[PDB]
């Protein structure tokens, strides 16, 4: 594995969860048992390392 960068759009493959985008700051309160979140547009909106 390797680290991640912000404001530079890249591809992310978290254990089979694949996607492309910028990895920017999360600023919303989440439940402790979350693995990943979604937005209104049915898209993977949040990711946890």
């Amino acid at each position: 594995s390797t680290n991640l960068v912000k404001n530079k759009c890249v591809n992310f493959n978290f254990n089979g969860l694949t996607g492309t985008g910028v990895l920017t700051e999360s600023n919303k309160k989440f439940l402790p048992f979350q693995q990943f979140g979604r937005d209104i547009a049915d898209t993977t909106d949040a990711v946890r390392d």
Binding site: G21, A41, D42, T43
Partner: peptide, 22 residues
């Protein structure tokens, strides 16, 4: 109020209008 009463990256592209909203 017309603008306010009226209330995205999945391969589609909402091309901005040639004539700007302004």
């Amino acid at each position: 109020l017309l603008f306010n009463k009226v209330t995205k990256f999945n391969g589609l592209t909402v091309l901005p209008p040639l004539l700007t909203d302004e």
